[PDB]
Symmetry: C2
């Protein structure tokens, strides 16, 4: 499957699907050891997935570019998604996201 | 519905769902007049949507951050998706994406 359409699971985990976590610009930085090993089987995956954009929102919210780099042709994307501070789950969402952002620095 | 889960259509279009296209740091820049007014009702939407990430890939591929500002708490993301230059359709994919990237600069 094209990288962007892959779904990580225990049998095909985040490292297998999307590479090792890291700081480089072509690397993903999200996930602690449990999420990396479990993918969408992770016990709190639906709480993470609620922030992932629909296809319409991905192209509607993001700043999209197209670049030729020494590795080939890339569609770039950047943006920001607001957390709903009136969601009763807000504080646990903050804790959950903090547990996974740049978690690889500690393993 | 939270912004990131909206689906734009003719009845609820890209501007209404995601704001006017423009140059600013967290403003969307993608779509010509046809896509803006049609959203996923756009006749060639599937050829754009093939590049959109799954939820797992979004959090697998992207650089994710969190920012706290006077407007609230924001989940930031950056990344890149590789185009398959060996796909016979590659030239048409590039043409389609280029038609929409920064298209707003050419119309009010």
């Amino acid at each position: 499957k094209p990288r962007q359409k892959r779904t990580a699971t225990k049998a095909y985990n985040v490292t297998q699907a999307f590479g090792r976590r890291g700081p480089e610009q072509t690397q993903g930085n999200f996930g602690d050891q449990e999420l990396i090993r479990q993918g969408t089987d992770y016990k709190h995956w639906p709480q993470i997935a609620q922030f992932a954009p629909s296809a319409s929102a991905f192209f509607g919210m993001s700043r999209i570019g197209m670049e030729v780099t020494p590795s080939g042709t890339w569609l770039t994307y950047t943006g920001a998604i607001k957390l709903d501070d009136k969601d009763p789950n807000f504080k646990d969402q903050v804790i959950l996201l903090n547990k996974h952002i740049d978690a690889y620095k500690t393993f």
